Structure formats: structure tokens, C-alpha cells
Design a protein around this ligand. Structure first.
Ligand SMILES: [Mg+2]
Ligand SMILES: [Mg+2]
Ligand SMILES: [Mg+2]
Ligand SMILES: [Mg+2]
Ligand SMILES: [Mg+2]
Ligand SMILES: [Mg+2]
Ligand SMILES: [Mg+2]
Ligand SMILES: [Mg+2]
Ligand SMILES: [Mg+2]
Ligand SMILES: [Mg+2]
Ligand SMILES: [Mg+2]
Ligand SMILES: [Mg+2]
Ligand SMILES: [Mg+2]
Ligand SMILES: [Mg+2]
Ligand SMILES: [Mg+2]
Ligand SMILES: [Mg+2]
Ligand SMILES: [Mg+2]
Ligand SMILES: [Mg+2]
Ligand SMILES: [Mg+2]
Ligand SMILES: [Mg+2]
Ligand SMILES: [Mg+2]
Ligand SMILES: [Mg+2]
Ligand SMILES: [Mg+2]
Ligand SMILES: [Mg+2]
Ligand SMILES: [Mg+2]
Ligand SMILES: [Mg+2]
Ligand SMILES: [Mg+2]
Ligand SMILES: [Mg+2]
Ligand SMILES: [Mg+2]
Ligand SMILES: [Mg+2]
Ligand SMILES: [Mg+2]
Ligand SMILES: [Mg+2]
Ligand SMILES: [Mg+2]
Ligand SMILES: [Mg+2]
Ligand SMILES: [Mg+2]
Ligand SMILES: [Mg+2]
Lengths: 131, 233, 155
RNA sequence: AUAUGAAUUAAUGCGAAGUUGAAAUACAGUUACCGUAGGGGAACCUGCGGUGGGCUUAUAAAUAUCUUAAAUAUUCUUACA
RNA sequence: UAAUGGUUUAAAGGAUCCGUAGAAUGAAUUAUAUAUAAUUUAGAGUUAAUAAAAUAUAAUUAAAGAAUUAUAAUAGUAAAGAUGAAAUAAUAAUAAUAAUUAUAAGACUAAUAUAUGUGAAAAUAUUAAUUAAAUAUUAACUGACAUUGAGGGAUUAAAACUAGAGUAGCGAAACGGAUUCGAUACCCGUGUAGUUCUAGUAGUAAACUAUGAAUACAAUUAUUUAUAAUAUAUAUAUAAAUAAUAAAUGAAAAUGAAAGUAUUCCACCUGAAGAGUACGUUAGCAAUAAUGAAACUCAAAACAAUAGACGGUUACAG
RNA sequence: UUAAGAGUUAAACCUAGCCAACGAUCCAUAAUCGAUAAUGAAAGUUAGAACGAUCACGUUGACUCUGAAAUAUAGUCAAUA
RNA sequence: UUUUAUAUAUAUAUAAUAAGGAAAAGUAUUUAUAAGAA
């Protein structure tokens, strides 16, 4: 099953905001691949101020590095990934949504699909792809 | 309303009145209405053919009529859902009338929007009196309009001088352009000749428009100054 | 031989007479065809035609299992003197209560005597009877000395 | 068990002229009723949900334009075209 | 001496569906004696392919949010709170109310929003996920396998009860303050059960569309809603929802694709009150739920509509 | 055992059956019916006096002889008077 | 409609052509029977 995860990672080091997002992406991707999964795409959304001063545990966050991960995997390890995300202090907010594959095997992320690129083949364009 | 009995059976009621003796003198209309029976059937009549295009209503093509496959490559072996539905409403609806010209006309005034500005008269004169040969566009007793172009297109296609709709339409269009250029030149040259020979014109179209604009603008001046004074306070 | 279908046809003909349609379609079966033919012989119907679900048959079509589902019998109704010729069409023998009369009871019914709560035959009325899978008028079934099922009334 | 009677005792019906509450019928002056719970002698009061057999009883934030006004349309009686 | 009766409103559609029997009903063609047999696909189904958010419904799990209450701190001052107006044994000088923060608690889900829809009904609209079910068309297949359904089975709002936990708001009962001739009521304060979750009992609602289910047919218009096309335009065609109607029906109001024309099955009704009462029986922990009379009294009783009067009934004018 | 079948009765041995919400079992009531009487247009409804057919009884219960056939208005025994 | 022609690749597009007209005078028993009112 294709699952789109949208994580809101906290920024604590003002000099290298991307480090914590890198560590989180590494962890989630490692879990997905080591539990018979596939990581179709990692779209690096930028740094954005949160709509409100959202609170996780005791720390209060005003901005976050947003990031997206499209990955094909099973339901059980998907729930495991969600559980790990929820208890992790690094992830302010997390959300996993199914992307249906009933009709087309390959589908892009919500962002590219909204732009107009239905599939990842269109994302990487089509030359010598008729082989 | 229910189909009314009393309106058409006036003769029968009057006959009963007369024979009973209730009425002594026959009405003047009695013999006439007896000679001319009123039509006493009010029935919805089935329609099997659309007159405008000749499409036949109420025909189903049976499975046997197709011994070959269709576009998708499938033989028709059993009737489908739409074929197994009674279509009496199709018979009893008034058929929509469709004509080929209606398309070309829509094209023409799309291609030449300013031809619409040329006024048209819908009062019919006499339709039966029309005696037109459409080997040429101009007809006596007719204006030169886009409908002439569509009529020439249909004449061209009917005689098979040209094969496709587009070709005949283009040929008629070019004849139309030539004729309209000739008329425009006549108008311009006629006005120039009139001015050449001493004709004096009281008012022209530009000055007429300017005059109307002036009246409207004066009223607008009064209203705007008054409204500015009103709004300021 | 569905009496349910004959009831449906009767109601359909009544409804068509009310709205005064000149043509209507009924299911194409032996019972319905015989019933329509009997009505037509008495003058209650203007014409019988064989056709599809869409309309009458433009050319003669043989009836086979391939097209049996889409076959229909088109009847032309009559409206004379601003009145429908075929005004009311009802069932005597209903599916819940089926009435099979012997010949003498059929004569008694024609002769003004109520039999098994059936109103006696009226002067300008027609009662149809089924005997040996053949539909006929009550008078013929009496003349044929055939005991039969008393189906419907057409007045 | 089928009956016949019984101290004691549960409810309900009628009527004579009256007596008391103001609960319902109008927005019945706390919208009524349905189910349920409690309070109260009772009528009824209150909480909870439902129904309309009450709100369909519904009724503006407004502005308007150009072709021969006539020796020509208006006049026309089966004509002429 | 009226059932050649009815059940939206006069008496009467079961809360909903599933399904057993039915000595209930039921497709087409041919042959044989009222059926049996063989064939067939129009009902009813099965499997795929395509299209669509099959998003809505059920259970479970994981989350979000505005606010409320309480406590604590900060400053700051004299009042605050409620009502028609007030006053309350437990607001405030023990620094209250209000403001700004910081903690914990439960419950609930604003806009979208029309319950449009989904669900058999009851119900259901904060988000995400797991599973289950629900749509239309085409193709293939079975070949009447269907409809309804006594008894029975399952689910069933709110209230209620049985165990545990929970208890921020609201709030029966109770305790007080007001109003009043009286207050046992409406208004006000504190507020117990309950409302909440889990595991159960029970199976009642104006459980309503006061309208059981299925099938054939029935004249229009207008919108949407959902598909299929054809090139925004065909005011495009096919369906269903909604609104107003024609005919028809009806005591009328009104219904209007059913309250119409017909067929099949089931449930229910036979004047008002006594009475959904008593007694008995069945089930439940109980409250209660189901089944359910009779005597006596009377010529009454009710529905729709009409014209009036009346309203602490509206608006318009003078 | 009977002229004769059958849990009709008596004895023996096996099986687990039989009826029932289309109403068993139990209780109350009742002689049944007609080409008889009444009534109604009729379907039906009521009566079962009178005419006729069948059954049962001759104060109550059981048994026995005779007989083709009787639990006889017989006999025996008991109950009641 | 039907048949045929020309053209084009057994079929397709255009054009022409249509057989359904017949006459004549005279030749009862109906059935069974349902009423409301204050
Ligand atoms: Mg009152
Ligand atoms: Mg009140
Ligand atoms: Mg109180
Ligand atoms: Mg409800
Ligand atoms: Mg009211
Ligand atoms: Mg109303
Ligand atoms: Mg009667
Ligand atoms: Mg009622
Ligand atoms: Mg209902
Ligand atoms: Mg909402
Ligand atoms: Mg069912
Ligand atoms: Mg609710
Ligand atoms: Mg508890
Ligand atoms: Mg609480
Ligand atoms: Mg409170
Ligand atoms: Mg009061
Ligand atoms: Mg209070
Ligand atoms: Mg509760
Ligand atoms: Mg339960
Ligand atoms: Mg109750
Ligand atoms: Mg009930
Ligand atoms: Mg009800
Ligand atoms: Mg009615
Ligand atoms: Mg009870
Ligand atoms: Mg034996
Ligand atoms: Mg025995
Ligand atoms: Mg024995
Ligand atoms: Mg019994
Ligand atoms: Mg006796
Ligand atoms: Mg006796
Ligand atoms: Mg006698
Ligand atoms: Mg008797
Ligand atoms: Mg005597
Ligand atoms: Mg004796
Ligand atoms: Mg004796
Ligand atoms: Mg004696």
C-alpha cells in the first residue's frame, strides 16, 4: 500500500535546520526498507512557521521543517512507523494517508499530483521510456 | 384539464332539446354543424419519423443483423439493458427538428461577427413566391446575407460540384467577399460623386453620434455635480 | 399463461384509454397474443402489430430465442364519439382465486344468474374463457361445450 | 379441578345541586404531546430525548440606450400586382 | 335490514429488517395428459473489466482543536455575580471580579452544512489508518434459483437498573433565595443521581412520511443530482431526488408517480368511556415489557371543511 | 380372545416414537340431522317443538346367563328412595 | 418498394424504373332480482 507521510520536524539548532529532518528521514526509510518496504519518494518541503505555537511534550514550537515521504509498505509496519513518530520528540506533527493504487500502479505525491504530474514517470519525464 | 365532452356535442344536446319539445325553433347553426361534424377524437398520436433529418424512430437492430464484430471487437450475442426498455415516450414526444444549416450559420456569424450588425427582417413577405436558382449568390427579391452563403454551400454540395462541406463553404465565402467588396465600393464612390456634384448633407453618422453623446453627457454632468455635492456632506 | 401478466395488461390498457394514446405495447406471448386477437375480433382494438421494444416491426422478423426478450405486440386503441371503445378491462379469475366453470354454469352466468359471485354477463360486454390453452369468448366456449377457466371482462 | 357463598378488600361507572385549582383549547400567558425518571394527595412541576399534531406563519440594498416624425407609417374593402 | 369495508388526518401499517412454514402467490416456448418433462432468458443472482472521492455507514485503533472549570503565580483595586427588580445558611479586604501567563481534568466537535448523502431502522458530518458493506455500464455465466412472510431471529433513541472506573460543564431529587392571596411552579444559588467509558439487563418513543413490502403501467413542466456521449456549445440524451401540477382518487384537507389504474403477501381496525385498566401467564436484578378482558353508563363520540366570535394574534394605513 | 382387523382387552419381547399456534391436551357447553320449521334476493343464519332418520337412556354404577345380536326396562351385587 | 445502370474497393455511393380497379336484384321465450328511515 502506498502511504504519504507528512512530518513536521522541530528545528532546535539554528545553524543547521536540516540535520534533524535528515536523521528522521534516515530512521523512517531504514524501517520501511528493512520491513519489506519501498521508499518511492522523499520531497523536501521547506522551513515554515507553524500556524500556532504548537506544543509537544513540554517544548513549545513556533516553526518547523516540513517534509514528505511517499512509501509503499504494509499496514502493520505503517502503524509501527506512526507509533514511532508519535512518541518521538523530534516529530511535532505527523500524518499518514493512503494513496490508492487500484487503477494505476505508480502515483506521485499529493504535491506533484496537485501541480498536474499524476505519476512519477511524468515527474522524471518521458524519453526512451517506450522500451 | 379533462377532455371536455360538452363543447363538441352541442348538436346532440340541441337535437334532444328540439325532439323533446323543450326548444321549438331549430338554431341557425344546427344544419351547418350537422353538415360539418366536429372532430371528436383527442388522441396522442405516435410519431415514427423525424421530418427535419429523416431519422427513423422506433427501430431496434436485432442480434442477427450483426454477423460481424463492432468497433471494440465484440460480437453482439444478447440484447443489452438499453435495448430491453420500452420506448413509447420516444414515439409520443414531439421530435426535435435539426438542420445542417444551423451549424454553418453558427460558424458564419462566428467568423464574421460584424455581419450580425447588418439588420435583418423576419417578416416573411411570401415564402411560396420564392423562385431562386442558386448557381449564383445574388437573388432578386432577396438581400445579400450569410444565409445566401449557406444556401450556396448546400447547392454546391447537392450538385456535387465540391465534395466536402468545408470546400463549398469556402467557395461561397469568397463569392460573398467579392460581392460585398463591390457593394462597399459602390457606396463609397456614390458618396464621393454626390460631394463632387454639389450635394449638401445636413448631418452625418459621426455628428449624429456626437450629438447623442452630448445630450447624454450633459445629463451626466448635472447628475455627477449634484451627486458629488450630495456625497461630500 | 401468467394471470399476473394478463392483469398487468388489463391495467395498462385501462391507463392507455384514460390518457387516450393511439398505440400501446404489451408483452409478446401466446396468451397475450390470443387475448389481444379476441379483443380485436370483437372490435375493441383497431390493429395488431408485431414489433420490438422500440416500435412496430418495419420488416417481418422471425421470432427466435435470441430476440424473444425484446419482442412486443403493439395494439391500436379505438376512441369513437369522444369515448374510448375499450373503457374497462378486468379479471374474473384472479391468481389468488381462480374460477373454472363447467359449461352449464357458464350458460347460467350468461343468462343473468350470478355464479360464484361473478356478475352476470352484461349486454355490450365480453367475457373470455380459456379452454385447453385456447382463449375464446364465453359464447363460443358454450357452443363448443367446453368447461373452462373464466378469465376477464371487457365492456 | 369444576362451581356455589363469604367477614376483609382493589378498582371503576352514573347522577342532584354545588365546591375547589387555572392544567388544555389563542403565543392559553412556562409551545403542546409521546416514552421514561423523580417530586407531589391530585391537577400538575421538573430533568432527559423525540415529534409538529408551532413557527413554509416564508414576500426588494433601488436606477436602462442612437436614424431619417412622414410628399413616406397611420389612411386602404377583393383591388391591383 | 351495508362490509358489491377500511388503516395520512375519523378505529386501525408491526420501531426496523432478515428469514422458516404457508394446506400463500409467481417468468417464456413446445409436447403429453389441471400438472409434469424438455428447452429459453425479460425476473432474481454469480464472476470479472471499465468509470467514479464508491469520501459518507459499522467496529477498532491512533490523533487534532476552540472553549469551560479548578488550582498556582503576576500585577492591580473595591466591589463582583444574577435578575423584570432583587436576594440567597457556603463571592470578595484571607485582596475578590476582570486582565496576562503556567498546570490538570474530563466532556464536546464552529465554519463547510443541505442529513445533500450513507445506514434495514435506531442513527450518523473534527482528522488519520485497519477490516467489512454499499454505485453505474459493458462482457461472460446460472436458468425462475423469485415476492411476501405467521411463529422465530437480530438491531433498536431517551429514560432506567446491575458492576467497575470517571465526574469539567449541564442537571431530576433535595436544600435555600425570590414572586405570589397561596408557590406546593415558572426566575435565582448550592447542587445528589444521571449525562461519559468499559462489560451487561431491558426492548419501550409523536421509534412519524402519523403513509408495510414487491411487481406492471400511468400526462407534463421546472430545477438539480449521477452517468453516457457529441462538437463552453449541442438550452444534448438516459436515470434518480426535489417542487408544482393534468387525469385519477378522496368526506374533504389533500395525494400525485402514490393516497392513481391493477396483481400478490403480511400486520392491524369494528361506537365513547370503563382501558391498555384489572386478573392470570411469560421474561427481567428491579423499574417494568409482552399478552389482555368483562360488567356497568350513554346516545353519543370523532374527522375535514364553512361562517362567525375570541386571542396577554401579526402587519399595513389612516 | 372374536365370525372377523387393530395396543380393543390380557401376556411377552423390541424400536422411540405419536399429536400440536391451520390450535394439541385440558375445561365449559351440547343429543345429531333432513327433501322438517323460521328468515333472507341469495350465500347463509337460527331451531332441532311438531313430521321423518340416527344415537343414547328407562332411578345410579359394575359385572353375569341366555342369545346371532344385551354390560338388556332381564339377573346378581352394591348406591339412593 | 423492387430491379437494373455507371463508378469505386462479394460489397459501397449516386441515377432511372411502381405490378395491387372489384361494379347487379332477391334470398318472442332475454331469464335472477338486494329500497331504507330518525
Ligand atoms: Mg392555563
Ligand atoms: Mg401552557
Ligand atoms: Mg422542586
Ligand atoms: Mg426519530
Ligand atoms: Mg399551537
Ligand atoms: Mg401547520
Ligand atoms: Mg349482506
Ligand atoms: Mg388514527
Ligand atoms: Mg412504519
Ligand atoms: Mg459542523
Ligand atoms: Mg422478506
Ligand atoms: Mg439523538
Ligand atoms: Mg454505575
Ligand atoms: Mg457528574
Ligand atoms: Mg447550573
Ligand atoms: Mg401554573
Ligand atoms: Mg433550580
Ligand atoms: Mg443511561
Ligand atoms: Mg440487549
Ligand atoms: Mg410503556
Ligand atoms: Mg408501541
Ligand atoms: Mg404506530
Ligand atoms: Mg382515506
Ligand atoms: Mg403493563
Ligand atoms: Mg394383535
Ligand atoms: Mg389405547
Ligand atoms: Mg403389554
Ligand atoms: Mg383447543
Ligand atoms: Mg345435555
Ligand atoms: Mg342429550
Ligand atoms: Mg323432533
Ligand atoms: Mg345446535
Ligand atoms: Mg313433547
Ligand atoms: Mg340400557
Ligand atoms: Mg343403566
Ligand atoms: Mg322417574
Amino acid at each position: 500500500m502506498l502511504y504519504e507521510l507528512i512530518g513536521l520536524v522541530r528545528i532546535t539548532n539554528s545553524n543547521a535546520p536540516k540535520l534533524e529532518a535528515k536523521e528522521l528521514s534516515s530512521t523512517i526509510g531504514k524501517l520501511i526498507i528493512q520491513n519489506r518496504g519501498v521508499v518511492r519518494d522523499i520531497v523536501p518541503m521547506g522551513i515554515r512557521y507553524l500556524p500556532k505555537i504548537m506544543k509537544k511534550d513540554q517544548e513549545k514550537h513556533f516553526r518547523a521543517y516540513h517534509f514528505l515521504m511517499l512509501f509503499d509498505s504494509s499496514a502493520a509496519v505503517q502503524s509501527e512507523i506512526l507509533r514511532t513518530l508519535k512518541k518521538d520528540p523530534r516529530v511535532i506533527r505527523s500524518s499518514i494517508v493512503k494513496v490508492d493504487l487500484d487503477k494505476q500502479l505508480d502515483r506521485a505525491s499529493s504535491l506533484h499530483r496537485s501541480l498536474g504530474k499524476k505519476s512519477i514517470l511524468e515527474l522524471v519525464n518521458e524519453d526512451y521510456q517506450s522500451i | 384539464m379533462k377532455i371536455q365532452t360538452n363543447a363538441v356535442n352541442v348538436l346532440q344536446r340541441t337535437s334532444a332539446y328540439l325532439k323533446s319539445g323543450l326548444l321549438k325553433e331549430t338554431p341557425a347553426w344546427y344544419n351547418v354543424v350537422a353538415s360539418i361534424p366536429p372532430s371528436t377524437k383527442f388522441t396522442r398520436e405516435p410519431r415514427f419519423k423525424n421530418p427535419s433529418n429523416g431519422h427513423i424512430i422506433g427501430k431496434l437492430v436485432d442480434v442477427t443483423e450483426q454477423p460481424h464484430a463492432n468497433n471494440k471487437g465484440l460480437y453482439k450475442t444478447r440484447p443489452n439493458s438499453s435495448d430491453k426498455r420500452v420506448g413509447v415516450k420516444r414515439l409520443y414526444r414531439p421530435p426535435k427538428l435539426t438542420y445542417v444549416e444551423d451549424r454553418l450559420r453558427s460558424l458564419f456569424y462566428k467568423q464574421h461577427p460584424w455581419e450580425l450588425s447588418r439588420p435583418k427582417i423576419l417578416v416573411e413577405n411570401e415564402i411560396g413566391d420564392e423562385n431562386y436558382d442558386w448557381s449564383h449568390m445574388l437573388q432578386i427579391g432577396r438581400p445579400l446575407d450569410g444565409e445566401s452563403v449557406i444556401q450556396r454551400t448546400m447547392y454546391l454540395i447537392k450538385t456535387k460540384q465540391y465534395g466536402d462541406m468545408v470546400e463549398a463553404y469556402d467557395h461561397a465565402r469568397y463569392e460573398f467577399y467579392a460581392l460585398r467588396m463591390q457593394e462597399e465600393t459602390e457606396q463609397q464612390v456614390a458618396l464621393e460623386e454626390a460631394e463632387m456634384f454639389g450635394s449638401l448633407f445636413g448631418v452625418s453618422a459621426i455628428e449624429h453620434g456626437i450629438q447623442k453623446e452630448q445630450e447624454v453627457l450633459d445629463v451626466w454632468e448635472k447628475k455627477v455635480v449634484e451627486e458629488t455635492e450630495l456625497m461630500a456632506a | 399463461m401468467s394471470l399476473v401478466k394478463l392483469a398487468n395488461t388489463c391495467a395498462h390498457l385501462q391507463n392507455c384509454s384514460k390518457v387516450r394514446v393511439a398505440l400501446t405495447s404489451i408483452p409478446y406471448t401466446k396468451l397475450q397474443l390470443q387475448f389481444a386477437y379476441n379483443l380485436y375480433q370483437q372490435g375493441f382494438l383497431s390493429s395488431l402489430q408485431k414489433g420490438s421494444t422500440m416500435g412496430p416491426d418495419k420488416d417481418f422478423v422471425e421470432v427466435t430465442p435470441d430476440n424473444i426478450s425484446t419482442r412486443r405486440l403493439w395494439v391500436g386503441l379505438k376512441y369513437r364519439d369522444n369515448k374510448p371503445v375499450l373503457s374497462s378491462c378486468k379479471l374474473i379469475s384472479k391468481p389468488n382465486s381462480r374460477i373454472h366453470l363447467p359449461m352449464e354454469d357458464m350458460k347460467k352466468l350468461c343468462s343473468g344468474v350470478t355464479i360464484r359471485n361473478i356478475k352476470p354477463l352484461q349486454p355490450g360486454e365480453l367475457i373470455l374463457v380459456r379452454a385447453h390453452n385456447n382463449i375464446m369468448d364465453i359464447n363460443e366456449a358454450i357452443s363448443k361445450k367446453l368447461d373452462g377457466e373464466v378469465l376477464c371482462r371487457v365492456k
